[PDB]
């Protein structure tokens, strides 16, 4: 079963707004994810063996975890919000997974973007 979320087109009036951020140093694999909210709450967690993509997603997860039943979340990561947006499209994820499975089984493959 493909369970779907519903997002608001505008901020929820009166709801806590979490400004979330995350970053992972490419060399140490050590990242920090966290938020500051309009109501003056702040949290910063540390993640071991992580990537930029994962910490940015983690920051959103934290906000969802620590927020009430109504919540506004502003991320500085286009990537994280993009992953979430694409999640409901089961067909696309299948297509992409099947490409990757094909790539795995090839003995040699040159794959390149040529403008």
PDB file of N, CA and C in Angstrom:
ATOM      1  N   UNK A   1       0.830  -1.198   0.000  1.00  0.00           N
ATOM      2  CA  UNK A   1       0.000   0.000   0.000  1.00  0.00           C
ATOM      3  C   UNK A   1       0.867   1.251   0.000  1.00  0.00           C
ATOM      4  N   UNK A   2       0.579   2.142  -0.939  1.00  0.00           N
ATOM      5  CA  UNK A   2       1.293   3.399  -1.066  1.00  0.00           C
ATOM      6  C   UNK A   2       0.589   4.492  -0.266  1.00  0.00           C
ATOM      7  N   UNK A   3       1.063   4.724   0.956  1.00  0.00           N
ATOM      8  CA  UNK A   3       0.461   5.714   1.845  1.00  0.00           C
ATOM      9  C   UNK A   3       0.957   7.111   1.492  1.00  0.00           C
ATOM     10  N   UNK A   4       0.021   8.028   1.267  1.00  0.00           N
ATOM     11  CA  UNK A   4       0.352   9.365   0.788  1.00  0.00           C
ATOM     12  C   UNK A   4       0.215  10.411   1.880  1.00  0.00           C
ATOM     13  N   UNK A   5       1.176  11.329   1.924  1.00  0.00           N
ATOM     14  CA  UNK A   5       1.094  12.488   2.801  1.00  0.00           C
ATOM     15  C   UNK A   5       0.398  13.625   2.065  1.00  0.00           C
ATOM     16  N   UNK A   6      -0.093  14.600   2.822  1.00  0.00           N
ATOM     17  CA  UNK A   6      -0.644  15.822   2.248  1.00  0.00           C
ATOM     18  C   UNK A   6       0.092  17.017   2.832  1.00  0.00           C
ATOM     19  N   UNK A   7       0.614  17.867   1.955  1.00  0.00           N
ATOM     20  CA  UNK A   7       1.307  19.076   2.380  1.00  0.00           C
ATOM     21  C   UNK A   7       0.455  20.317   2.162  1.00  0.00           C
ATOM     22  N   UNK A   8       0.685  21.319   3.002  1.00  0.00           N
ATOM     23  CA  UNK A   8       0.013  22.605   2.879  1.00  0.00           C
ATOM     24  C   UNK A   8       0.716  23.466   1.837  1.00  0.00           C
ATOM     25  N   UNK A   9      -0.061  24.287   1.136  1.00  0.00           N
ATOM     26  CA  UNK A   9       0.487  25.180   0.122  1.00  0.00           C
ATOM     27  C   UNK A   9       1.030  26.459   0.751  1.00  0.00           C
ATOM     28  N   UNK A  10       0.569  26.762   1.962  1.00  0.00           N
ATOM     29  CA  UNK A  10       1.017  27.946   2.686  1.00  0.00           C
ATOM     30  C   UNK A  10       1.299  27.575   4.136  1.00  0.00           C
ATOM     31  N   UNK A  11       2.100  28.397   4.835  1.00  0.00           N
ATOM     32  CA  UNK A  11       2.367  28.148   6.255  1.00  0.00           C
ATOM     33  C   UNK A  11       1.096  28.040   7.088  1.00  0.00           C
ATOM     34  N   UNK A  12       1.129  27.160   8.083  1.00  0.00           N
ATOM     35  CA  UNK A  12       0.021  26.985   9.007  1.00  0.00           C
ATOM     36  C   UNK A  12       0.103  28.088  10.055  1.00  0.00           C
ATOM     37  N   UNK A  13      -0.929  28.924  10.130  1.00  0.00           N
ATOM     38  CA  UNK A  13      -0.925  30.041  11.067  1.00  0.00           C
ATOM     39  C   UNK A  13      -0.900  29.518  12.499  1.00  0.00           C
ATOM     40  N   UNK A  14       0.028  30.042  13.293  1.00  0.00           N
ATOM     41  CA  UNK A  14       0.115  29.694  14.697  1.00  0.00           C
ATOM     42  C   UNK A  14       0.972  28.476  14.989  1.00  0.00           C
ATOM     43  N   UNK A  15       1.342  27.738  13.948  1.00  0.00           N
ATOM     44  CA  UNK A  15       2.173  26.550  14.118  1.00  0.00           C
ATOM     45  C   UNK A  15       3.636  26.937  14.277  1.00  0.00           C
ATOM     46  N   UNK A  16       4.384  26.113  14.998  1.00  0.00           N
ATOM     47  CA  UNK A  16       5.813  26.329  15.169  1.00  0.00           C
ATOM     48  C   UNK A  16       6.515  26.141  13.835  1.00  0.00           C
ATOM     49  N   UNK A  17       7.389  27.081  13.489  1.00  0.00           N
ATOM     50  CA  UNK A  17       8.176  26.988  12.265  1.00  0.00           C
ATOM     51  C   UNK A  17       9.606  26.585  12.596  1.00  0.00           C
ATOM     52  N   UNK A  18      10.012  25.421  12.098  1.00  0.00           N
ATOM     53  CA  UNK A  18      11.369  24.926  12.284  1.00  0.00           C
ATOM     54  C   UNK A  18      12.225  25.309  11.083  1.00  0.00           C
ATOM     55  N   UNK A  19      13.309  26.041  11.324  1.00  0.00           N
ATOM     56  CA  UNK A  19      14.300  26.281  10.283  1.00  0.00           C
ATOM     57  C   UNK A  19      15.396  25.240  10.450  1.00  0.00           C
ATOM     58  N   UNK A  20      15.398  24.249   9.568  1.00  0.00           N
ATOM     59  CA  UNK A  20      16.264  23.091   9.729  1.00  0.00           C
ATOM     60  C   UNK A  20      17.476  23.168   8.814  1.00  0.00           C
ATOM     61  N   UNK A  21      18.580  22.593   9.272  1.00  0.00           N
ATOM     62  CA  UNK A  21      19.813  22.579   8.501  1.00  0.00           C
ATOM     63  C   UNK A  21      20.633  21.365   8.892  1.00  0.00           C
ATOM     64  N   UNK A  22      21.458  20.909   7.960  1.00  0.00           N
ATOM     65  CA  UNK A  22      22.360  19.810   8.218  1.00  0.00           C
ATOM     66  C   UNK A  22      23.541  19.880   7.279  1.00  0.00           C
ATOM     67  N   UNK A  23      24.684  19.403   7.751  1.00  0.00           N
ATOM     68  CA  UNK A  23      25.890  19.390   6.942  1.00  0.00           C
ATOM     69  C   UNK A  23      26.827  18.311   7.454  1.00  0.00           C
ATOM     70  N   UNK A  24      27.534  17.669   6.530  1.00  0.00           N
ATOM     71  CA  UNK A  24      28.500  16.640   6.881  1.00  0.00           C
ATOM     72  C   UNK A  24      29.825  16.903   6.186  1.00  0.00           C
ATOM     73  N   UNK A  25      30.874  17.041   6.988  1.00  0.00           N
ATOM     74  CA  UNK A  25      32.223  17.213   6.473  1.00  0.00           C
ATOM     75  C   UNK A  25      32.629  16.007   5.636  1.00  0.00           C
ATOM     76  N   UNK A  26      32.984  16.264   4.382  1.00  0.00           N
ATOM     77  CA  UNK A  26      33.245  15.202   3.417  1.00  0.00           C
ATOM     78  C   UNK A  26      34.445  14.338   3.794  1.00  0.00           C
ATOM     79  N   UNK A  27      35.313  14.858   4.656  1.00  0.00           N
ATOM     80  CA  UNK A  27      36.539  14.154   5.016  1.00  0.00           C
ATOM     81  C   UNK A  27      36.372  13.263   6.245  1.00  0.00           C
ATOM     82  N   UNK A  28      35.666  13.763   7.256  1.00  0.00           N
ATOM     83  CA  UNK A  28      35.530  13.044   8.520  1.00  0.00           C
ATOM     84  C   UNK A  28      34.293  12.153   8.553  1.00  0.00           C
ATOM     85  N   UNK A  29      33.359  12.395   7.637  1.00  0.00           N
ATOM     86  CA  UNK A  29      32.081  11.688   7.635  1.00  0.00           C
ATOM     87  C   UNK A  29      31.274  12.007   8.893  1.00  0.00           C
ATOM     88  N   UNK A  30      31.671  13.063   9.600  1.00  0.00           N
ATOM     89  CA  UNK A  30      30.947  13.517  10.781  1.00  0.00           C
ATOM     90  C   UNK A  30      30.025  14.663  10.387  1.00  0.00           C
ATOM     91  N   UNK A  31      28.743  14.522  10.708  1.00  0.00           N
ATOM     92  CA  UNK A  31      27.755  15.524  10.356  1.00  0.00           C
ATOM     93  C   UNK A  31      26.938  16.001  11.538  1.00  0.00           C
ATOM     94  N   UNK A  32      26.357  17.188  11.391  1.00  0.00           N
ATOM     95  CA  UNK A  32      25.452  17.744  12.386  1.00  0.00           C
ATOM     96  C   UNK A  32      24.144  18.135  11.719  1.00  0.00           C
ATOM     97  N   UNK A  33      23.036  17.742  12.337  1.00  0.00           N
ATOM     98  CA  UNK A  33      21.709  18.121  11.875  1.00  0.00           C
ATOM     99  C   UNK A  33      20.999  18.808  13.024  1.00  0.00           C
ATOM    100  N   UNK A  34      20.137  19.767  12.713  1.00  0.00           N
ATOM    101  CA  UNK A  34      19.454  20.493  13.762  1.00  0.00           C
ATOM    102  C   UNK A  34      18.469  21.524  13.266  1.00  0.00           C
ATOM    103  N   UNK A  35      17.928  22.295  14.202  1.00  0.00           N
ATOM    104  CA  UNK A  35      16.939  23.304  13.876  1.00  0.00           C
ATOM    105  C   UNK A  35      16.949  24.438  14.882  1.00  0.00           C
ATOM    106  N   UNK A  36      16.425  25.577  14.449  1.00  0.00           N
ATOM    107  CA  UNK A  36      16.020  26.648  15.340  1.00  0.00           C
ATOM    108  C   UNK A  36      14.571  26.922  14.967  1.00  0.00           C
ATOM    109  N   UNK A  37      13.721  27.163  15.961  1.00  0.00           N
ATOM    110  CA  UNK A  37      12.315  27.446  15.692  1.00  0.00           C
ATOM    111  C   UNK A  37      11.961  28.876  16.077  1.00  0.00           C
ATOM    112  N   UNK A  38      10.851  29.370  15.537  1.00  0.00           N
ATOM    113  CA  UNK A  38      10.387  30.719  15.833  1.00  0.00           C
ATOM    114  C   UNK A  38      10.049  30.887  17.310  1.00  0.00           C
ATOM    115  N   UNK A  39       9.728  29.779  17.971  1.00  0.00           N
ATOM    116  CA  UNK A  39       9.392  29.803  19.391  1.00  0.00           C
ATOM    117  C   UNK A  39      10.634  29.665  20.270  1.00  0.00           C
ATOM    118  N   UNK A  40      11.807  29.806  19.663  1.00  0.00           N
ATOM    119  CA  UNK A  40      13.047  29.891  20.412  1.00  0.00           C
ATOM    120  C   UNK A  40      13.610  28.560  20.878  1.00  0.00           C
ATOM    121  N   UNK A  41      13.123  27.463  20.306  1.00  0.00           N
ATOM    122  CA  UNK A  41      13.686  26.148  20.592  1.00  0.00           C
ATOM    123  C   UNK A  41      14.814  25.853  19.616  1.00  0.00           C
ATOM    124  N   UNK A  42      15.845  25.171  20.103  1.00  0.00           N
ATOM    125  CA  UNK A  42      16.996  24.829  19.279  1.00  0.00           C
ATOM    126  C   UNK A  42      17.547  23.462  19.655  1.00  0.00           C
ATOM    127  N   UNK A  43      17.857  22.664  18.639  1.00  0.00           N
ATOM    128  CA  UNK A  43      18.478  21.364  18.849  1.00  0.00           C
ATOM    129  C   UNK A  43      19.511  21.095  17.770  1.00  0.00           C
ATOM    130  N   UNK A  44      20.623  20.502  18.188  1.00  0.00           N
ATOM    131  CA  UNK A  44      21.688  20.103  17.286  1.00  0.00           C
ATOM    132  C   UNK A  44      22.121  18.707  17.694  1.00  0.00           C
ATOM    133  N   UNK A  45      22.004  17.758  16.773  1.00  0.00           N
ATOM    134  CA  UNK A  45      22.440  16.393  17.026  1.00  0.00           C
ATOM    135  C   UNK A  45      23.624  16.071  16.135  1.00  0.00           C
ATOM    136  N   UNK A  46      24.436  15.123  16.583  1.00  0.00           N
ATOM    137  CA  UNK A  46      25.603  14.689  15.834  1.00  0.00           C
ATOM    138  C   UNK A  46      25.363  13.280  15.313  1.00  0.00           C
ATOM    139  N   UNK A  47      25.839  13.035  14.099  1.00  0.00           N
ATOM    140  CA  UNK A  47      25.644  11.766  13.422  1.00  0.00           C
ATOM    141  C   UNK A  47      26.995  11.182  13.051  1.00  0.00           C
ATOM    142  N   UNK A  48      27.165   9.893  13.319  1.00  0.00           N
ATOM    143  CA  UNK A  48      28.416   9.212  13.023  1.00  0.00           C
ATOM    144  C   UNK A  48      28.327   8.470  11.698  1.00  0.00           C
ATOM    145  N   UNK A  49      29.367   8.616  10.883  1.00  0.00           N
ATOM    146  CA  UNK A  49      29.449   7.944   9.594  1.00  0.00           C
ATOM    147  C   UNK A  49      28.266   8.328   8.710  1.00  0.00           C
ATOM    148  N   UNK A  50      28.242   9.587   8.282  1.00  0.00           N
ATOM    149  CA  UNK A  50      27.097  10.130   7.559  1.00  0.00           C
ATOM    150  C   UNK A  50      27.535  10.978   6.369  1.00  0.00           C
ATOM    151  N   UNK A  51      26.555  11.381   5.565  1.00  0.00           N
ATOM    152  CA  UNK A  51      26.791  12.167   4.361  1.00  0.00           C
ATOM    153  C   UNK A  51      25.932  13.423   4.414  1.00  0.00           C
ATOM    154  N   UNK A  52      26.240  14.398   3.565  1.00  0.00           N
ATOM    155  CA  UNK A  52      25.463  15.632   3.504  1.00  0.00           C
ATOM    156  C   UNK A  52      23.978  15.362   3.289  1.00  0.00           C
ATOM    157  N   UNK A  53      23.683  14.447   2.373  1.00  0.00           N
ATOM    158  CA  UNK A  53      22.309  14.119   2.009  1.00  0.00           C
ATOM    159  C   UNK A  53      21.538  13.569   3.204  1.00  0.00           C
ATOM    160  N   UNK A  54      22.193  12.707   3.971  1.00  0.00           N
ATOM    161  CA  UNK A  54      21.560  12.070   5.117  1.00  0.00           C
ATOM    162  C   UNK A  54      21.321  13.035   6.281  1.00  0.00           C
ATOM    163  N   UNK A  55      22.261  13.948   6.522  1.00  0.00           N
ATOM    164  CA  UNK A  55      22.115  14.914   7.611  1.00  0.00           C
ATOM    165  C   UNK A  55      21.008  15.914   7.309  1.00  0.00           C
ATOM    166  N   UNK A  56      20.896  16.317   6.049  1.00  0.00           N
ATOM    167  CA  UNK A  56      19.846  17.244   5.654  1.00  0.00           C
ATOM    168  C   UNK A  56      18.476  16.599   5.836  1.00  0.00           C
ATOM    169  N   UNK A  57      18.374  15.316   5.502  1.00  0.00           N
ATOM    170  CA  UNK A  57      17.134  14.576   5.715  1.00  0.00           C
ATOM    171  C   UNK A  57      16.887  14.386   7.207  1.00  0.00           C
ATOM    172  N   UNK A  58      17.965  14.185   7.956  1.00  0.00           N
ATOM    173  CA  UNK A  58      17.871  13.985   9.396  1.00  0.00           C
ATOM    174  C   UNK A  58      17.311  15.225  10.086  1.00  0.00           C
ATOM    175  N   UNK A  59      17.733  16.397   9.622  1.00  0.00           N
ATOM    176  CA  UNK A  59      17.282  17.656  10.204  1.00  0.00           C
ATOM    177  C   UNK A  59      15.765  17.789  10.084  1.00  0.00           C
ATOM    178  N   UNK A  60      15.223  17.348   8.954  1.00  0.00           N
ATOM    179  CA  UNK A  60      13.781  17.375   8.730  1.00  0.00           C
ATOM    180  C   UNK A  60      13.100  16.374   9.646  1.00  0.00           C
ATOM    181  N   UNK A  61      13.695  15.192   9.759  1.00  0.00           N
ATOM    182  CA  UNK A  61      13.160  14.141  10.611  1.00  0.00           C
ATOM    183  C   UNK A  61      13.069  14.602  12.064  1.00  0.00           C
ATOM    184  N   UNK A  62      14.120  15.267  12.534  1.00  0.00           N
ATOM    185  CA  UNK A  62      14.150  15.808  13.888  1.00  0.00           C
ATOM    186  C   UNK A  62      12.998  16.774  14.110  1.00  0.00           C
ATOM    187  N   UNK A  63      12.797  17.665  13.145  1.00  0.00           N
ATOM    188  CA  UNK A  63      11.766  18.687  13.243  1.00  0.00           C
ATOM    189  C   UNK A  63      10.394  18.036  13.356  1.00  0.00           C
ATOM    190  N   UNK A  64      10.194  16.964  12.599  1.00  0.00           N
ATOM    191  CA  UNK A  64       8.925  16.250  12.606  1.00  0.00           C
ATOM    192  C   UNK A  64       8.728  15.547  13.941  1.00  0.00           C
ATOM    193  N   UNK A  65       9.810  14.967  14.442  1.00  0.00           N
ATOM    194  CA  UNK A  65       9.816  14.271  15.720  1.00  0.00           C
ATOM    195  C   UNK A  65       9.515  15.203  16.897  1.00  0.00           C
ATOM    196  N   UNK A  66      10.124  16.386  16.902  1.00  0.00           N
ATOM    197  CA  UNK A  66      10.035  17.298  18.044  1.00  0.00           C
ATOM    198  C   UNK A  66       8.865  18.282  17.977  1.00  0.00           C
ATOM    199  N   UNK A  67       8.137  18.282  16.864  1.00  0.00           N
ATOM    200  CA  UNK A  67       7.064  19.252  16.658  1.00  0.00           C
ATOM    201  C   UNK A  67       5.712  18.698  17.084  1.00  0.00           C
ATOM    202  N   UNK A  68       4.741  19.590  17.245  1.00  0.00           N
ATOM    203  CA  UNK A  68       3.378  19.189  17.527  1.00  0.00           C
ATOM    204  C   UNK A  68       2.706  18.652  16.279  1.00  0.00           C
ATOM    205  N   UNK A  69       1.389  18.502  16.335  1.00  0.00           N
ATOM    206  CA  UNK A  69       0.645  17.888  15.243  1.00  0.00           C
ATOM    207  C   UNK A  69       0.508  18.801  14.031  1.00  0.00           C
ATOM    208  N   UNK A  70       0.774  20.088  14.228  1.00  0.00           N
ATOM    209  CA  UNK A  70       0.834  21.036  13.127  1.00  0.00           C
ATOM    210  C   UNK A  70       2.214  21.675  13.136  1.00  0.00           C
ATOM    211  N   UNK A  71       2.845  21.748  11.969  1.00  0.00           N
ATOM    212  CA  UNK A  71       4.228  22.199  11.906  1.00  0.00           C
ATOM    213  C   UNK A  71       4.616  22.767  10.543  1.00  0.00           C
ATOM    214  N   UNK A  72       5.383  23.850  10.587  1.00  0.00           N
ATOM    215  CA  UNK A  72       5.963  24.459   9.405  1.00  0.00           C
ATOM    216  C   UNK A  72       7.451  24.140   9.414  1.00  0.00           C
ATOM    217  N   UNK A  73       7.979  23.649   8.297  1.00  0.00           N
ATOM    218  CA  UNK A  73       9.401  23.321   8.225  1.00  0.00           C
ATOM    219  C   UNK A  73      10.046  23.941   6.999  1.00  0.00           C
ATOM    220  N   UNK A  74      11.058  24.765   7.246  1.00  0.00           N
ATOM    221  CA  UNK A  74      11.837  25.391   6.190  1.00  0.00           C
ATOM    222  C   UNK A  74      13.231  24.782   6.173  1.00  0.00           C
ATOM    223  N   UNK A  75      13.564  24.123   5.070  1.00  0.00           N
ATOM    224  CA  UNK A  75      14.883  23.534   4.887  1.00  0.00           C
ATOM    225  C   UNK A  75      15.701  24.397   3.935  1.00  0.00           C
ATOM    226  N   UNK A  76      17.022  24.339   4.074  1.00  0.00           N
ATOM    227  CA  UNK A  76      17.920  25.047   3.170  1.00  0.00           C
ATOM    228  C   UNK A  76      18.466  24.085   2.122  1.00  0.00           C
ATOM    229  N   UNK A  77      17.897  22.883   2.085  1.00  0.00           N
ATOM    230  CA  UNK A  77      18.346  21.837   1.176  1.00  0.00           C
ATOM    231  C   UNK A  77      17.279  21.501   0.149  1.00  0.00           C
ATOM    232  N   UNK A  78      17.535  21.906  -1.088  1.00  0.00           N
ATOM    233  CA  UNK A  78      16.690  21.556  -2.217  1.00  0.00           C
ATOM    234  C   UNK A  78      16.634  20.043  -2.363  1.00  0.00           C
ATOM    235  N   UNK A  79      17.776  19.406  -2.113  1.00  0.00           N
ATOM    236  CA  UNK A  79      17.931  17.968  -2.291  1.00  0.00           C
ATOM    237  C   UNK A  79      16.971  17.175  -1.419  1.00  0.00           C
ATOM    238  N   UNK A  80      16.950  17.503  -0.133  1.00  0.00           N
ATOM    239  CA  UNK A  80      16.168  16.745   0.839  1.00  0.00           C
ATOM    240  C   UNK A  80      14.686  16.832   0.504  1.00  0.00           C
ATOM    241  N   UNK A  81      14.227  18.037   0.188  1.00  0.00           N
ATOM    242  CA  UNK A  81      12.822  18.240  -0.124  1.00  0.00           C
ATOM    243  C   UNK A  81      12.472  17.559  -1.446  1.00  0.00           C
ATOM    244  N   UNK A  82      13.444  17.505  -2.352  1.00  0.00           N
ATOM    245  CA  UNK A  82      13.273  16.815  -3.618  1.00  0.00           C
ATOM    246  C   UNK A  82      13.077  15.316  -3.444  1.00  0.00           C
ATOM    247  N   UNK A  83      13.903  14.700  -2.601  1.00  0.00           N
ATOM    248  CA  UNK A  83      13.772  13.276  -2.296  1.00  0.00           C
ATOM    249  C   UNK A  83      12.371  12.980  -1.765  1.00  0.00           C
ATOM    250  N   UNK A  84      11.901  13.821  -0.849  1.00  0.00           N
ATOM    251  CA  UNK A  84      10.591  13.632  -0.234  1.00  0.00           C
ATOM    252  C   UNK A  84       9.479  13.764  -1.272  1.00  0.00           C
ATOM    253  N   UNK A  85       9.597  14.769  -2.133  1.00  0.00           N
ATOM    254  CA  UNK A  85       8.619  14.999  -3.189  1.00  0.00           C
ATOM    255  C   UNK A  85       8.528  13.813  -4.142  1.00  0.00           C
ATOM    256  N   UNK A  86       9.669  13.194  -4.430  1.00  0.00           N
ATOM    257  CA  UNK A  86       9.727  12.110  -5.405  1.00  0.00           C
ATOM    258  C   UNK A  86       9.283  10.766  -4.825  1.00  0.00           C
ATOM    259  N   UNK A  87       9.195  10.685  -3.502  1.00  0.00           N
ATOM    260  CA  UNK A  87       8.921   9.419  -2.825  1.00  0.00           C
ATOM    261  C   UNK A  87       7.618   8.732  -3.274  1.00  0.00           C
ATOM    262  N   UNK A  88       6.514   9.492  -3.394  1.00  0.00           N
ATOM    263  CA  UNK A  88       5.241   8.887  -3.808  1.00  0.00           C
ATOM    264  C   UNK A  88       5.256   8.248  -5.199  1.00  0.00           C
ATOM    265  N   UNK A  89       6.142   8.697  -6.083  1.00  0.00           N
ATOM    266  CA  UNK A  89       6.195   8.171  -7.444  1.00  0.00           C
ATOM    267  C   UNK A  89       6.862   6.793  -7.475  1.00  0.00           C
ATOM    268  N   UNK A  90       6.088   5.755  -7.171  1.00  0.00           N
ATOM    269  CA  UNK A  90       6.601   4.387  -7.140  1.00  0.00           C
ATOM    270  C   UNK A  90       7.141   3.949  -8.494  1.00  0.00           C
ATOM    271  N   UNK A  91       6.499   4.411  -9.561  1.00  0.00           N
ATOM    272  CA  UNK A  91       6.891   4.027 -10.908  1.00  0.00           C
ATOM    273  C   UNK A  91       8.290   4.529 -11.227  1.00  0.00           C
ATOM    274  N   UNK A  92       8.594   5.754 -10.811  1.00  0.00           N
ATOM    275  CA  UNK A  92       9.888   6.338 -11.128  1.00  0.00           C
ATOM    276  C   UNK A  92      10.999   5.660 -10.335  1.00  0.00           C
ATOM    277  N   UNK A  93      10.742   5.382  -9.062  1.00  0.00           N
ATOM    278  CA  UNK A  93      11.725   4.711  -8.222  1.00  0.00           C
ATOM    279  C   UNK A  93      12.016   3.308  -8.757  1.00  0.00           C
ATOM    280  N   UNK A  94      10.985   2.641  -9.270  1.00  0.00           N
ATOM    281  CA  UNK A  94      11.155   1.328  -9.890  1.00  0.00           C
ATOM    282  C   UNK A  94      12.041   1.429 -11.124  1.00  0.00           C
ATOM    283  N   UNK A  95      11.666   2.332 -12.023  1.00  0.00           N
ATOM    284  CA  UNK A  95      12.441   2.614 -13.225  1.00  0.00           C
ATOM    285  C   UNK A  95      13.904   2.882 -12.893  1.00  0.00           C
ATOM    286  N   UNK A  96      14.148   3.740 -11.907  1.00  0.00           N
ATOM    287  CA  UNK A  96      15.518   4.071 -11.520  1.00  0.00           C
ATOM    288  C   UNK A  96      16.229   2.860 -10.907  1.00  0.00           C
ATOM    289  N   UNK A  97      15.533   2.105 -10.061  1.00  0.00           N
ATOM    290  CA  UNK A  97      16.118   0.899  -9.472  1.00  0.00           C
ATOM    291  C   UNK A  97      16.454  -0.157 -10.519  1.00  0.00           C
ATOM    292  N   UNK A  98      15.611  -0.264 -11.539  1.00  0.00           N
ATOM    293  CA  UNK A  98      15.813  -1.259 -12.584  1.00  0.00           C
ATOM    294  C   UNK A  98      16.977  -0.868 -13.496  1.00  0.00           C
ATOM    295  N   UNK A  99      17.162   0.433 -13.701  1.00  0.00           N
ATOM    296  CA  UNK A  99      18.347   0.946 -14.381  1.00  0.00           C
ATOM    297  C   UNK A  99      19.595   0.538 -13.612  1.00  0.00           C
ATOM    298  N   UNK A 100      19.575   0.766 -12.303  1.00  0.00           N
ATOM    299  CA  UNK A 100      20.732   0.489 -11.464  1.00  0.00           C
ATOM    300  C   UNK A 100      21.030  -1.006 -11.445  1.00  0.00           C
ATOM    301  N   UNK A 101      19.980  -1.818 -11.401  1.00  0.00           N
ATOM    302  CA  UNK A 101      20.156  -3.262 -11.456  1.00  0.00           C
ATOM    303  C   UNK A 101      20.796  -3.668 -12.784  1.00  0.00           C
ATOM    304  N   UNK A 102      20.351  -3.055 -13.879  1.00  0.00           N
ATOM    305  CA  UNK A 102      20.973  -3.289 -15.180  1.00  0.00           C
ATOM    306  C   UNK A 102      22.450  -2.899 -15.151  1.00  0.00           C
ATOM    307  N   UNK A 103      22.747  -1.727 -14.598  1.00  0.00           N
ATOM    308  CA  UNK A 103      24.123  -1.240 -14.539  1.00  0.00           C
ATOM    309  C   UNK A 103      25.007  -2.188 -13.735  1.00  0.00           C
ATOM    310  N   UNK A 104      24.455  -2.735 -12.658  1.00  0.00           N
ATOM    311  CA  UNK A 104      25.192  -3.669 -11.813  1.00  0.00           C
ATOM    312  C   UNK A 104      25.571  -4.935 -12.580  1.00  0.00           C
ATOM    313  N   UNK A 105      24.684  -5.398 -13.453  1.00  0.00           N
ATOM    314  CA  UNK A 105      24.891  -6.670 -14.141  1.00  0.00           C
ATOM    315  C   UNK A 105      25.764  -6.562 -15.392  1.00  0.00           C
ATOM    316  N   UNK A 106      25.939  -5.352 -15.917  1.00  0.00           N
ATOM    317  CA  UNK A 106      26.808  -5.162 -17.081  1.00  0.00           C
ATOM    318  C   UNK A 106      28.246  -5.475 -16.683  1.00  0.00           C
ATOM    319  N   UNK A 107      29.034  -5.973 -17.630  1.00  0.00           N
ATOM    320  CA  UNK A 107      30.446  -6.238 -17.377  1.00  0.00           C
ATOM    321  C   UNK A 107      31.255  -4.948 -17.470  1.00  0.00           C
ATOM    322  N   UNK A 108      30.922  -4.118 -18.454  1.00  0.00           N
ATOM    323  CA  UNK A 108      31.522  -2.795 -18.599  1.00  0.00           C
ATOM    324  C   UNK A 108      30.497  -1.838 -19.184  1.00  0.00           C
ATOM    325  N   UNK A 109      30.396  -0.641 -18.614  1.00  0.00           N
ATOM    326  CA  UNK A 109      29.491   0.370 -19.155  1.00  0.00           C
ATOM    327  C   UNK A 109      30.037   1.792 -19.039  1.00  0.00           C
ATOM    328  N   UNK A 110      30.164   2.434 -20.197  1.00  0.00           N
ATOM    329  CA  UNK A 110      30.492   3.848 -20.294  1.00  0.00           C
ATOM    330  C   UNK A 110      29.183   4.605 -20.386  1.00  0.00           C
ATOM    331  N   UNK A 111      28.930   5.442 -19.391  1.00  0.00           N
ATOM    332  CA  UNK A 111      27.712   6.233 -19.345  1.00  0.00           C
ATOM    333  C   UNK A 111      28.099   7.688 -19.125  1.00  0.00           C
ATOM    334  N   UNK A 112      27.706   8.545 -20.063  1.00  0.00           N
ATOM    335  CA  UNK A 112      28.197   9.917 -20.095  1.00  0.00           C
ATOM    336  C   UNK A 112      27.160  10.891 -20.622  1.00  0.00           C
ATOM    337  N   UNK A 113      27.147  12.085 -20.038  1.00  0.00           N
ATOM    338  CA  UNK A 113      26.383  13.198 -20.572  1.00  0.00           C
ATOM    339  C   UNK A 113      27.276  14.006 -21.510  1.00  0.00           C
ATOM    340  N   UNK A 114      26.836  14.139 -22.756  1.00  0.00           N
ATOM    341  CA  UNK A 114      27.523  14.955 -23.749  1.00  0.00           C
ATOM    342  C   UNK A 114      26.559  16.056 -24.182  1.00  0.00           C
ATOM    343  N   UNK A 115      26.862  17.326 -23.853  1.00  0.00           N
ATOM    344  CA  UNK A 115      25.881  18.378 -24.155  1.00  0.00           C
ATOM    345  C   UNK A 115      25.606  18.539 -25.650  1.00  0.00           C
TER     346      UNK A 115
END
